[PDB]
Coordinates of C-alpha atoms and ligand atoms in Angstrom, one line a residue:
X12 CA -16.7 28.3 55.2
X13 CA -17.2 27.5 51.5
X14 CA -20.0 27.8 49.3
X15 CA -19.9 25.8 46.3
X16 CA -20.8 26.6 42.6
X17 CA -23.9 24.2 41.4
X18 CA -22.5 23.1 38.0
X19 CA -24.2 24.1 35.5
X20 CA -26.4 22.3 32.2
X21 CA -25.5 21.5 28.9
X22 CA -29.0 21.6 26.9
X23 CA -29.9 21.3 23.4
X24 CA -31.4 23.7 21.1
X25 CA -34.9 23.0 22.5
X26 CA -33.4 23.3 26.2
X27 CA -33.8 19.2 26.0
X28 CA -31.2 18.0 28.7
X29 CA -28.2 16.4 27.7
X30 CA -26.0 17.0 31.0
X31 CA -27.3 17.7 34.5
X32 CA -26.3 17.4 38.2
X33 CA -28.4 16.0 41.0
X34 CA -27.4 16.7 45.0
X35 CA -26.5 13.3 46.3
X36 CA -24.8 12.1 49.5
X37 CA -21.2 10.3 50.3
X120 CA -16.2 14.6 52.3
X121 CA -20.4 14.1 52.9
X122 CA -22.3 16.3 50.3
X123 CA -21.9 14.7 46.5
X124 CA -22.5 16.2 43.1
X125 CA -23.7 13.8 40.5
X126 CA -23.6 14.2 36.8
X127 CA -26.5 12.8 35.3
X128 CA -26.7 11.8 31.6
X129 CA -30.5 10.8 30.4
X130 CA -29.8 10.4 27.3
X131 CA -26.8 7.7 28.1
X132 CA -24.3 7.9 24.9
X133 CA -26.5 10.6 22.9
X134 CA -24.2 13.1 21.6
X135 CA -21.8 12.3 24.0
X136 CA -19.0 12.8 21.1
X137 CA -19.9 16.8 21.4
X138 CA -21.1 16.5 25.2
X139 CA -18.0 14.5 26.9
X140 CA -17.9 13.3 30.8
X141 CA -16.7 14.6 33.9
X142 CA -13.7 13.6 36.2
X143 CA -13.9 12.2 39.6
X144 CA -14.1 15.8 41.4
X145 CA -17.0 16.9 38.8
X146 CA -15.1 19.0 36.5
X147 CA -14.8 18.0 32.7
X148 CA -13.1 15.5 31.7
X149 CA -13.3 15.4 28.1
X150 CA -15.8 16.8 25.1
X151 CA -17.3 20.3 25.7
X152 CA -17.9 19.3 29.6
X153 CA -14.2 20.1 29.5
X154 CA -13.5 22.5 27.2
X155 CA -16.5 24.8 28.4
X156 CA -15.7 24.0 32.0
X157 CA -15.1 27.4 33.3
X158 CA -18.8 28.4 31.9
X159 CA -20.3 25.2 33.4
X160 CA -18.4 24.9 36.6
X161 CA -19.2 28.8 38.0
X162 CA -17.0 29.9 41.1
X163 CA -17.1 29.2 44.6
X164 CA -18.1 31.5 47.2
X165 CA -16.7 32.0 50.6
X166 CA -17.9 33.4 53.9
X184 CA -18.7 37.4 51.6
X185 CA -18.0 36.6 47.9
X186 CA -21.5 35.1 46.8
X187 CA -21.4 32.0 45.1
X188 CA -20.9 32.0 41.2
X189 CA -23.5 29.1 39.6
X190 CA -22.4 27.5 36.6
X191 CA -24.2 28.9 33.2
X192 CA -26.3 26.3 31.4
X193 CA -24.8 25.9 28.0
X194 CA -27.4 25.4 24.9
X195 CA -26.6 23.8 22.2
X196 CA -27.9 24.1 18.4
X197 CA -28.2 20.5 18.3
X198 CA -31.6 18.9 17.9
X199 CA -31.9 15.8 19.8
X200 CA -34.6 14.3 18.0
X201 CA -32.4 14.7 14.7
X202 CA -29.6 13.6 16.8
X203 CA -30.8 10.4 17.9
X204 CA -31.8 9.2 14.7
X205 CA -28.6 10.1 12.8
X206 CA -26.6 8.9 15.6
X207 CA -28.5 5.4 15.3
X208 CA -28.4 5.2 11.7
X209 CA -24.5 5.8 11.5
X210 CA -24.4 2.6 14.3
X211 CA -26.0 0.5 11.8
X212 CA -24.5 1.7 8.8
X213 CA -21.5 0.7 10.2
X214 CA -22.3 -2.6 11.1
X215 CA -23.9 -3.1 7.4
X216 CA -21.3 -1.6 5.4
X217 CA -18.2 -3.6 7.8
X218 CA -16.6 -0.5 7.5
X219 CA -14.0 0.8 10.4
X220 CA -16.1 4.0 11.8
X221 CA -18.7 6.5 10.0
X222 CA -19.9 9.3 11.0
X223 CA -22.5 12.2 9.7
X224 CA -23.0 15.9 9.7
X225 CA -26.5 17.4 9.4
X226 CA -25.9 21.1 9.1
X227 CA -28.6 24.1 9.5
X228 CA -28.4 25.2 5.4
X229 CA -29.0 28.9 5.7
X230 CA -27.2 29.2 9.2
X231 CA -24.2 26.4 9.6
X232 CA -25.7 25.2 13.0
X233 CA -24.4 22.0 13.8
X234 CA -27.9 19.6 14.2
X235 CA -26.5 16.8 14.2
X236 CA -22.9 15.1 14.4
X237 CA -22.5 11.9 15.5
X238 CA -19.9 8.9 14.6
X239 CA -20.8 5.0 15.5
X240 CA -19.4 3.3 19.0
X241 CA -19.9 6.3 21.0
X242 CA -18.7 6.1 24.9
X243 CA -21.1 6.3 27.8
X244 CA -20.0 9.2 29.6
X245 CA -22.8 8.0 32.7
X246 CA -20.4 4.9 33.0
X247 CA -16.1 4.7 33.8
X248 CA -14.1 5.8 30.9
X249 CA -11.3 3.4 31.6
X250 CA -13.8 0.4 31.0
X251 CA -14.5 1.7 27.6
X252 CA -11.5 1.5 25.8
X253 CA -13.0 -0.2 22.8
X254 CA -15.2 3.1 22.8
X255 CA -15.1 6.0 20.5
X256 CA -14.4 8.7 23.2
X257 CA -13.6 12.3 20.9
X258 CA -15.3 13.2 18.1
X259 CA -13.9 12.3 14.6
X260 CA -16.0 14.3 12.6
X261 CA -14.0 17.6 13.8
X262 CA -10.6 15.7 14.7
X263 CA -10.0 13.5 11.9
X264 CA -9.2 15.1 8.3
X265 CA -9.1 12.5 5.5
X266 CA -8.8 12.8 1.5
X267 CA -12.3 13.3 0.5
X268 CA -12.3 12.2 -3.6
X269 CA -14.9 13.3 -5.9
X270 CA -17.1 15.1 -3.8
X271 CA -14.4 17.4 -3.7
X272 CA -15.6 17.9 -7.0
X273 CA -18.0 20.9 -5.6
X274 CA -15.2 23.3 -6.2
X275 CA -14.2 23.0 -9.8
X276 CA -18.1 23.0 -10.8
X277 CA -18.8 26.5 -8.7
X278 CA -15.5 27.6 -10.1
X279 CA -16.2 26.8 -14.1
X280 CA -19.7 28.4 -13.1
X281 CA -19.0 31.2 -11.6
X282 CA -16.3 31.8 -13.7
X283 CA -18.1 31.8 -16.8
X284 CA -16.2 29.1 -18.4
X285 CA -18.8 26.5 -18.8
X286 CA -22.7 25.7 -18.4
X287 CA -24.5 23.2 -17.5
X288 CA -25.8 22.3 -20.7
X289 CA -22.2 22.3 -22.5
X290 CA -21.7 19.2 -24.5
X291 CA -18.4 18.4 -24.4
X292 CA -16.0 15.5 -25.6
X293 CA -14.6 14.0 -22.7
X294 CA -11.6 11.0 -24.1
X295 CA -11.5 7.9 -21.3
X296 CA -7.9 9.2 -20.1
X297 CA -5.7 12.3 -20.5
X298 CA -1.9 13.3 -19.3
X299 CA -1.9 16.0 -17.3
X300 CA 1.2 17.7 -15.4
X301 CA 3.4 15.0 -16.3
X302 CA 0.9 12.3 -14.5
X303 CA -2.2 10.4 -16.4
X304 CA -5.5 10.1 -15.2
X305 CA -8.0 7.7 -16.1
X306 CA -11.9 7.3 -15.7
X307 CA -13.1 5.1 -13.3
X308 CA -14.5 3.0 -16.4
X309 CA -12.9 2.4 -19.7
X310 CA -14.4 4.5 -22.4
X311 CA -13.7 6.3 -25.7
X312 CA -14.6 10.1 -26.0
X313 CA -18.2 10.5 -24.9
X314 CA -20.4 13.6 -25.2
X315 CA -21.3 14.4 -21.6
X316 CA -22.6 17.6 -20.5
X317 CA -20.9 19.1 -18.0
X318 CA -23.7 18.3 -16.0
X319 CA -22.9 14.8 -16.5
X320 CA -19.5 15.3 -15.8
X321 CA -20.3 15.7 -12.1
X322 CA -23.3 13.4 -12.4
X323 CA -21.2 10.7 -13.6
X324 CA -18.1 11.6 -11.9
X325 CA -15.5 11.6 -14.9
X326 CA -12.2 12.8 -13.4
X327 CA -11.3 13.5 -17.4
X328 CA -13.9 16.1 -17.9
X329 CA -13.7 17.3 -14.0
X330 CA -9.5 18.0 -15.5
X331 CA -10.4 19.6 -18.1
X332 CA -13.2 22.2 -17.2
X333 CA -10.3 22.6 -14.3
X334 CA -7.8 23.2 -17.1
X335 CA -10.3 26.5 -18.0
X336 CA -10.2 27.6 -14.8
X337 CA -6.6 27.7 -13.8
X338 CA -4.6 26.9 -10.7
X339 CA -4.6 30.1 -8.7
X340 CA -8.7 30.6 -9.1
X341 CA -8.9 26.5 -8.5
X342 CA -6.5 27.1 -5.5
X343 CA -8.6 30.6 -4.5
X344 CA -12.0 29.0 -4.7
X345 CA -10.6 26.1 -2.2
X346 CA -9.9 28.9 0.4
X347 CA -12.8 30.7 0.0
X348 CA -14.8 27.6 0.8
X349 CA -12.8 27.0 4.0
X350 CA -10.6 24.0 3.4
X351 CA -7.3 23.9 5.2
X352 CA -8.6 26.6 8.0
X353 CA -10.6 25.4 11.1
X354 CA -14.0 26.3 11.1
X355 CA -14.3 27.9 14.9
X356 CA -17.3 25.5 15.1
X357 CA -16.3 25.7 19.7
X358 CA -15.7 22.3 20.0
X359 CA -12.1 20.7 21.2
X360 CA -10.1 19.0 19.2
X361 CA -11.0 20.5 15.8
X362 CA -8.1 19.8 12.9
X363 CA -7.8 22.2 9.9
X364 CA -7.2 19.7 7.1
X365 CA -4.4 20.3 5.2
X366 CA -4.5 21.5 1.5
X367 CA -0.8 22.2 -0.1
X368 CA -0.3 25.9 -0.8
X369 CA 0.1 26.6 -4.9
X370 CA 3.2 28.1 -4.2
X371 CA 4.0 24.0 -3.4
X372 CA 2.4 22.4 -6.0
X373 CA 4.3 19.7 -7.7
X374 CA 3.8 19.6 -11.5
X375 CA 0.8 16.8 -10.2
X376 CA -1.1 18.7 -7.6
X377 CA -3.4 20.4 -10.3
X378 CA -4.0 16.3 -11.5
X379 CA -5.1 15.6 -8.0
X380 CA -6.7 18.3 -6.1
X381 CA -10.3 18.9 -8.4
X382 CA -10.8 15.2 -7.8
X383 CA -10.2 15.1 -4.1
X384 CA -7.1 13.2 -3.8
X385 CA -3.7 15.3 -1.8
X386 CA -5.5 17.4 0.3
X387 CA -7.1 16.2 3.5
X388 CA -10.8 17.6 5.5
X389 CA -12.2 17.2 8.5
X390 CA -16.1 15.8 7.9
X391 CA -16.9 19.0 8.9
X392 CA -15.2 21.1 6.4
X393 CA -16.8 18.5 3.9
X394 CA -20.3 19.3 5.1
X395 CA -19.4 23.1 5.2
X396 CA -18.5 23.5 1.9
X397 CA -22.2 22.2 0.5
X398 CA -23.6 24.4 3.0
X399 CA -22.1 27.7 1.2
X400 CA -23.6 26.5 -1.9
X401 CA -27.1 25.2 0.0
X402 CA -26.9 28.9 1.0
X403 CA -27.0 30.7 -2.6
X404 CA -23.6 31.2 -2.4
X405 CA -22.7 32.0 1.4
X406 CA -20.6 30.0 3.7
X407 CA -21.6 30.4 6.9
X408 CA -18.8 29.1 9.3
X409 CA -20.8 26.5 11.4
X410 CA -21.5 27.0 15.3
X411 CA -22.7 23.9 18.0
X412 CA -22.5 26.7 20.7
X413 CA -26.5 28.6 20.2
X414 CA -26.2 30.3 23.6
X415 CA -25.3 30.3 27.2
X416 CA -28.2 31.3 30.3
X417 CA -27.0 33.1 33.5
X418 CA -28.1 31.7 37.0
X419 CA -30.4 34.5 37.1
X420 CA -31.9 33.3 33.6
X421 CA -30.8 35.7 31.2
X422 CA -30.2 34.1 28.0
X423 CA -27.4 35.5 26.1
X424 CA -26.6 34.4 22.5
X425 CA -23.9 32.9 20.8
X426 CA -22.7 35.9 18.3
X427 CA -23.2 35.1 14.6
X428 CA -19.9 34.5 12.6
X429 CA -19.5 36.8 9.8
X430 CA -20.6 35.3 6.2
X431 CA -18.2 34.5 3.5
X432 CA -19.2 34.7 -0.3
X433 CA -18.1 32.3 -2.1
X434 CA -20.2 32.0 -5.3
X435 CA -23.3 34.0 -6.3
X436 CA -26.4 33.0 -5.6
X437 CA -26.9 32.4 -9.3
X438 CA -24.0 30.1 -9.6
X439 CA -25.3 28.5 -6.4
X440 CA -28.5 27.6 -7.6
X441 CA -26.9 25.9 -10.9
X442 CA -24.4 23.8 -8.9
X443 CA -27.7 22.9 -7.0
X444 CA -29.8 22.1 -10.1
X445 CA -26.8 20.2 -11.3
X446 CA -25.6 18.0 -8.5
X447 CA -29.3 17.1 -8.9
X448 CA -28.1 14.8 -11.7
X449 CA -26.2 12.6 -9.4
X450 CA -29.0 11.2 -8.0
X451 CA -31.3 10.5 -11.0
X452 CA -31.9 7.0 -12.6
X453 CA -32.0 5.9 -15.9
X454 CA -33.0 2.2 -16.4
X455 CA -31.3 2.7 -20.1
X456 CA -28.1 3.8 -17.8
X457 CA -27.5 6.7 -20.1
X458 CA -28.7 9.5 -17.9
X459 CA -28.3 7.8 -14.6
X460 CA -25.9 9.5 -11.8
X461 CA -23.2 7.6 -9.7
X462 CA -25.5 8.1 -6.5
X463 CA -29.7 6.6 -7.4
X464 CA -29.9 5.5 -4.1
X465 CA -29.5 8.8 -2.8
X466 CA -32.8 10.4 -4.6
X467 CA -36.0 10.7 -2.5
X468 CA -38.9 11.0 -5.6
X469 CA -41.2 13.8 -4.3
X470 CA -38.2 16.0 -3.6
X471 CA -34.9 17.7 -5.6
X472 CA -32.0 16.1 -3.4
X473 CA -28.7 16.8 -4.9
X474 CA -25.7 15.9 -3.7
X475 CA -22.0 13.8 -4.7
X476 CA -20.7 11.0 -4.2
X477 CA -16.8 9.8 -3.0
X478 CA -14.6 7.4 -2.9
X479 CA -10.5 8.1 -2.2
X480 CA -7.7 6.0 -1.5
X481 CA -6.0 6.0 1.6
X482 CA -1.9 6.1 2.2
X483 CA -0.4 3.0 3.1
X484 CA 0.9 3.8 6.4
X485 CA 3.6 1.3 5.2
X486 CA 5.3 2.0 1.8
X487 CA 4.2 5.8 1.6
X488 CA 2.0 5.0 -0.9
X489 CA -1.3 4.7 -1.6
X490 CA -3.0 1.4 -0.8
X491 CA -4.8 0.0 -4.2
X492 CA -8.4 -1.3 -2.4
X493 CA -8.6 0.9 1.0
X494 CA -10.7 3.6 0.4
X495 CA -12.6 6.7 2.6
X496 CA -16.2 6.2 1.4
X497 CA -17.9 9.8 1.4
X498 CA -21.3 11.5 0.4
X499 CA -22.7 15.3 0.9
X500 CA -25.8 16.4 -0.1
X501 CA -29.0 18.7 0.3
X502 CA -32.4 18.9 0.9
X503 CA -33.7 20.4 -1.5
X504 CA -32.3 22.0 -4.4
X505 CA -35.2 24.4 -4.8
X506 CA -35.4 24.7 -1.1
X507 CA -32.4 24.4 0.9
X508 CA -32.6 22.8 4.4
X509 CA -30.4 20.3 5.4
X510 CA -27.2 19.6 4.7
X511 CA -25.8 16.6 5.0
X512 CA -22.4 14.8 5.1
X513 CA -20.8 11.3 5.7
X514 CA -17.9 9.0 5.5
X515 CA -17.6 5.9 5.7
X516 CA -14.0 4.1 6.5
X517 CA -13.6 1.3 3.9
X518 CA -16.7 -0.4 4.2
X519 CA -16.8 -4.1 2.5
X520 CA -20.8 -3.0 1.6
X521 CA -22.9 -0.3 0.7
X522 CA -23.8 1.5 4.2
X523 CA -27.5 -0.5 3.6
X524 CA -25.7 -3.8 3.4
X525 CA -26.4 -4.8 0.1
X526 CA -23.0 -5.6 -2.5
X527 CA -20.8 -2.3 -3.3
X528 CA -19.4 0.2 -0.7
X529 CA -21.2 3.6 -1.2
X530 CA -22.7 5.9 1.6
X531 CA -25.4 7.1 -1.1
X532 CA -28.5 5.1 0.8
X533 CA -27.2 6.4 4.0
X534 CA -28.2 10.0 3.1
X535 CA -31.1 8.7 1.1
X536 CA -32.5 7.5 4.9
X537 CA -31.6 10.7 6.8
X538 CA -32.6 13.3 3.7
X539 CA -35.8 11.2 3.4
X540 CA -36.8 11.1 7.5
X541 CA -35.5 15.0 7.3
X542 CA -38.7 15.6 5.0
X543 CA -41.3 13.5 6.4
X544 CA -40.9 14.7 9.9
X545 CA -41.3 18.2 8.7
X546 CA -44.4 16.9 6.3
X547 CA -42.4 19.0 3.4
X548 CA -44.8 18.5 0.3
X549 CA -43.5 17.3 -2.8
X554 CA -39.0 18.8 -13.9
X555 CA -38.1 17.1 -17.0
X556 CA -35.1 15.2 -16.7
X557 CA -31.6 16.3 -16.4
X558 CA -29.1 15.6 -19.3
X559 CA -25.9 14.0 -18.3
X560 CA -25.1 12.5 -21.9
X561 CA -25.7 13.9 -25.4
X562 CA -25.6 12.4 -28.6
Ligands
MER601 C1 -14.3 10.1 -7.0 O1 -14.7 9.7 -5.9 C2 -13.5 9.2 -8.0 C3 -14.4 8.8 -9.2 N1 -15.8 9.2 -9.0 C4 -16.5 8.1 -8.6 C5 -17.8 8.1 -8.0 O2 -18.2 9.3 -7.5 O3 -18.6 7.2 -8.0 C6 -15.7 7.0 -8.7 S1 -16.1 5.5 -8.1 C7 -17.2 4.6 -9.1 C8 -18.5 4.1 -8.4 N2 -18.2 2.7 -8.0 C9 -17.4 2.1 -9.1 C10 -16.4 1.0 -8.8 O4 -15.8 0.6 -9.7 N3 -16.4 0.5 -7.5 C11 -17.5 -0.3 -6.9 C12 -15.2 0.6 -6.7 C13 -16.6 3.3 -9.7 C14 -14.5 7.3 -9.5 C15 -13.3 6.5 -8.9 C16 -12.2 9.9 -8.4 C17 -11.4 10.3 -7.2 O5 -11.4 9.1 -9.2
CO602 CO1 -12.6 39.3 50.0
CO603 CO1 -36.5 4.8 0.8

């Protein structure tokens, strides 16, 4: 009397299969859920329950698309759509690989990466290490990453937070890149003081090598020129506290105090990244506005859904958000470049040299943020969220790329330090070659 609903596929962008179900036999007649591709993506993807429903990930949260109706006899038989993702597997497997190892290298807790589409926010990759095997028994897998961090799990993101007050002072008209300016090693500042990460008297760095050194001094003051309430407007309009719609379960919206909160400190805190908290996501979203010449694009895993029948039907665009001109884009672009150049006379070398790739104009910023001491309410003194965004390239953007790292004891490449810099140095680089993209004078971070 009943006529089941075949379940439907879950499919990358290249209609490569990720989830699948095969007839089998046993109550006699047995669906089984096949994943090839074991724990690829299975973060985004999930598993299904015992009566092949979803159980978790977008298996379950997509599982009225995927699971169709069932007919009866007449009401015909309602087969489950196939569900394509903009992931690229290829890309996938080779982030999702290298965030294993980085972890193991760096000791840290987890890490995980973003790879984001730069003109349209498609989500190509997004993976985090120890990812579960949804083709085996969830309840042997407790020591597994089952959900997916990288949408669920906001942390303070320090100086690569930093995006905001450059685009701001920028677009803003309050400072260029080429401004020498006098930046003393400390200042007080709404009743708290704030140091640089490296005892120094006043030096003459550009604001280009304000953000290519990190100083939190000059990052203060060129914040001071801009105010609170276009600081605190600019951190809307690039999406922070506010979920990003991305169709994945789980996703948290960070959490970024509203002005009319602030303590007389916030201001101190905020333009370096410290008392507001973003999903990886978020992170990654907020260089892809500026990869786009100024337009945020809210990013999307969901590219489209086919019909039994074989109609494709796709996923509606989200609406774009300006943030910046494209002008002002393409000089936080330039300038970010900075972070990544090296100087063997250290005078015009960025924070992040590891991250360059020499043939090509990667820019990006590099993080480090204390965590809170889930014991005193504090902030611990040597726990730190390890973060890094970038993008490939400056003159060309395609790729945008974010990662954290969770206190690693090493750089995510093993060797002494704890920075996620040669982590996006490996995925920026293979992001080029694969693609065969062919290959100025250098930037000025410190004056005279
Ligand atoms: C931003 O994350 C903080 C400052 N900016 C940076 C930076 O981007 O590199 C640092 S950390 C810098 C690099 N490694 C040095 C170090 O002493 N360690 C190995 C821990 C210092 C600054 C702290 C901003 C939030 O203060
Ligand atoms: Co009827
Ligand atoms: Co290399």
């Amino acid at each position: 009397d009943v006529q089941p609903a075949a379940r439907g596929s879950i499919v990358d962008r290249n209609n490569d299969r990720l989830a699948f179900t095969i007839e089998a036999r046993a109550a006699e007649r047995q669906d089984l859920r096949q994943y090839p591709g074991g724990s690829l993506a299975a973060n985004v993807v999930g598993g299904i329950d015992w009566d092949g429903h979803g159980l978790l990930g977008l298996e379950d949260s997509l599982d009225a698309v995927l699971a169709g109706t069932d007919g009866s006899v007449r009401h015909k038989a309602v087969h489950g759509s196939t569900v394509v993702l903009t992931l690229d597997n290829d890309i996938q497997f080779y982030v999702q690989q290298q965030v294993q190892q980085a972890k193991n290298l760096s000791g840290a807790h987890n890490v995980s990466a973003v790879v984001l589409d730069a003109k349209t926010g498609e989500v190509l990759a997004m993976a985090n290490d120890n990812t579960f095997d949804p083709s085996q028994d969830i309840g042997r897998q407790g020591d597994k990453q089952l959900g997916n961090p990288a949408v669920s799990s906001p942390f303070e993101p320090g100086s690569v937070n930093k995006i905001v007050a450059a685009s701001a002072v920028i677009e803003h008209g309050l400072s260029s890149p080429d401004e020498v300016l006098q930046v003393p090693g400390s200042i007080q500042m709404g009743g708290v003081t704030v140091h640089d990460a490296w005892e120094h008297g006043v030096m003459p760095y550009t604001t280009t090598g304000v953000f290519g050194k990190s100083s939190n001094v000059g990052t203060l003051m060129l914040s001071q020129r801009v105010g609170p309430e276009r600081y605190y407007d600019m951190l809307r309009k690039f999406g922070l506290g506010q979920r990003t719609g991305v169709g994945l379960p789980g996703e948290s919206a960070g959490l970024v105090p509203p002005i009319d909160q602030w303590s007389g400190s916030t201001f101190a805190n905020l333009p370096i990244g410290q008392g507001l908290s973003m999903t990886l996501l978020q992170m990654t979203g907020m260089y892809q506005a500026i990869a786009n010449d100024g337009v945020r694009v809210p990013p999307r895993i969901i590219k489209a859904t086919v019909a039994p029948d074989g109609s494709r039907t796709e996923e509606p665009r989200p609406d774009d958000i300006r943030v910046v001109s494209a002008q002002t884009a393409q000089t936080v672009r330039q300038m970010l470049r900075a972070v990544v150049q090296r100087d063997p006379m250290g005078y015009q070398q960025g924070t992040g040299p590891t991250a360059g790739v020499p043939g090509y104009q990667m820019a990006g910023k590099t993080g480090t943020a204390q965590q809170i001491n889930p014991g005193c309410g504090c902030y611990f003194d040597d726990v730190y969220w390890i973060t890094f965004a970038g993008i490939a390239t400056a003159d060309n953007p395609r790729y945008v790329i974010g990662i954290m790292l969770d206190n690693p004891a090493r750089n995510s490449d093993g060797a002494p330090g704890h920075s996620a810099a040669p982590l996006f140095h490996n995925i920026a680089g293979w992001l080029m070659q694969r693609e065969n993209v062919p290959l100025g004078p250098p930037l000025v971070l410190q004056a005279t």
